[PDB]
Symmetry: C3
């Protein structure tokens, strides 16, 4: 219930550091949060918004960055810690990454077991993997690009046929990755209602209060995925053997 | 303005707090709030996050401006599934540093029936050249010693498809080769302070320093051809598999 | 120090609003503002974003602390083109979850006229080994039941380049497929606890109140990493195996007749 007046309004915080927080709400602690907004209103149609969720909130310690552009200037977009958190998720995939150069994969000092050749039994299986062209039903419905890849289930049906994986829950090989995700809810702005106020004398006045609703973003679910790079490492090992053996049958027969 | 007085604090009560920006009277195209770890409107002063209004020229933009962007305690995720991307045609990330290889999933979205690689597309993929290259500018500095990169030139894969009638001079049936046109990127940025002078009915002339913001071009309109290395390697795996099978064939027909 | 009083509202007028942090009189090195969705200076209290001042030990750092980071209504983008990165040598993302495969583009940047993979290089590439492994970490927690990954060891590929004269036994490498990085240590100023602070009257009376104590921590010490570009590896492997297939076919076409 305050407005900072000015060309520009300024709030300057003194001390060693400044703190702008949200007290534990008296009557609905589950919605505890601050909404920072570039616009006039509590609705995000009003301007860009960043929302910090209190620990007492349904979606606890959540942050939602809401804008039509998220531009990170002057520095890499990094994880705080090394190799603990990820980009995206099973039910939060980015459509793609646009890169100036090919991804770098590294262990950063972390050490592996002793490197091991692709056992022949595994190669026999890998031969049954199919490299296919496909389309999305959704896309074709609107017209539509063809994509190249390998159906996760296709690799899975093969992993089973060759006894490598029990009919997942878990999987021995990271190239085929199964995940199981909860449902994602969020409390978001709906509209502002009119609320009537009448005194004991009986006169009626109105004010505008915003209405927030809990909304489902996506439901519970599971998913199978693959690691293309892993697939290509295995294909490499695969074909190299097919080349080793073919050059033996070329020699014994040349002479 | 207000100033808040070894640590200053602002506690917001109620169910939630709201800190927002009214609609400017005279320049609603500039509607925004600048949050700064420092005392100056200039980002040389401290890390900044700027929320743009809907009225702003750059509607609902967010600019995070710091010398480190460290996201702690949680994955960096898109709000929705398979609707937003990392980077852009003219907003490329140099790379991603990963502890493991990317996971690609369809999360249950439906695909058409998995189809083999036709022999026509395979004949053509045989013309796709794998190559080494260096960046001219690096070559300006280190010449022969400039770092060497691997890949395939987007345009020459385009040429191969066009030659093999799997594409026309337009601008593609395949996801492996992806073209994009992109708008110019502008922003409003702090440049310098400007001394403004204020003179009253009496001759008196006072002085002050107001900050000037200006509209800067970050990049002009352009277009770009690109490729998905993973898509390239899927076509290759197909290609190379057809060849070895013929190799297997030949061989068999030497023991008979 | 103020409190704003179902919802509290601060509203900034003028063209734009500025909310900043003055230069600290005593400890300018801690200059920063902490935004919190919760009641306390501790992050356990709620999601926080900390903006570091230029004067701060960690100059112009931003720290986003939450249990979810959800980016809505727009791609997560770098401000400029091809100058900043996702993750780092000592700040790696475990993975990226995508719906389609990454797009690599040069956006019009000039290249040296592309060259074939030379025979000398292909020769060496043959010694590169494709292997399997587990993380010494995973095993200490899942034993022989830990996930098995595919890839190559950056060191054995280096040995291959070294043994073939393509690379001096020289941290700076000639090919981008093999990445070496040297990195600084990472500290951060972080809330640890509350302390007992004694207050002595001018009459000698000692009262007491608690205040939050921030402390400097070491997130990780300096170090270095060798890494590889899997894509780069496959580009070379596609050139290698193509030359081999070619030599095999010629031996076939010669065997016949
Ligand atoms: Br509103
Ligand atoms: Br599509
Ligand atoms: Br593709
Ligand atoms: Br490379
Ligand atoms: Ca793998
Ligand atoms: Cl300034």
């Amino acid at each position: 219930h305050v407005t900072i007046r000015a060309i520009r309004s300024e709030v300057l915080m003194e001390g060693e550091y400044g703190f702008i927080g949200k007290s534990i709400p008296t009557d609905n602690p589950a919605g505890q949060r601050i909404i920072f907004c570039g616009g006039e209103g509590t609705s995000s149609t009003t301007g860009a918004q960043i929302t910090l969720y209190g620990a007492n909130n349904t979606d606890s310690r959540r942050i939602v960055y809401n804008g039509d552009e998220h531009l990170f200037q002057s520095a890499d977009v990094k994880p705080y810690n090394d190799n603990v958190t990820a980009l995206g998720g099973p039910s939060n995939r980015f459509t793609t990454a646009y890169l100036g150069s090919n991804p770098i994969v590294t262990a950063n000092g972390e050490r592996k077991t002793e490197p091991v050749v692709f056992d022949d039994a595994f190669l026999d299986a890998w031969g049954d993997v199919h490299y296919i062209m496909y389309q999305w039903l959704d896309a074709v419905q609107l017209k539509a690009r063809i994509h190249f890849g390998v159906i996760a289930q296709q690799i899975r049906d093969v992993f089973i046929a060759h006894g490598l994986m029990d009919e997942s829950t878990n999987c021995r090989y990271a190239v085929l990755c199964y995940d199981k995700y909860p449902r994602m809810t969020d409390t978001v702005f709906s509209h502002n209602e009119i609320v009537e106020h009448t005194d004991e004398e009986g006169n009626v006045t109105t004010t505008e209060e915003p209405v927030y609703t809990e909304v489902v973003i996506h439901e519970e679910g599971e998913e199978w995925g693959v690691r293309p790079d892993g697939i290509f490492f295995a294909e490499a090992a695969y074909q190299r053997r097919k080349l080793e053996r073919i050059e033996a049958r070329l020699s014994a027969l040349e002479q």
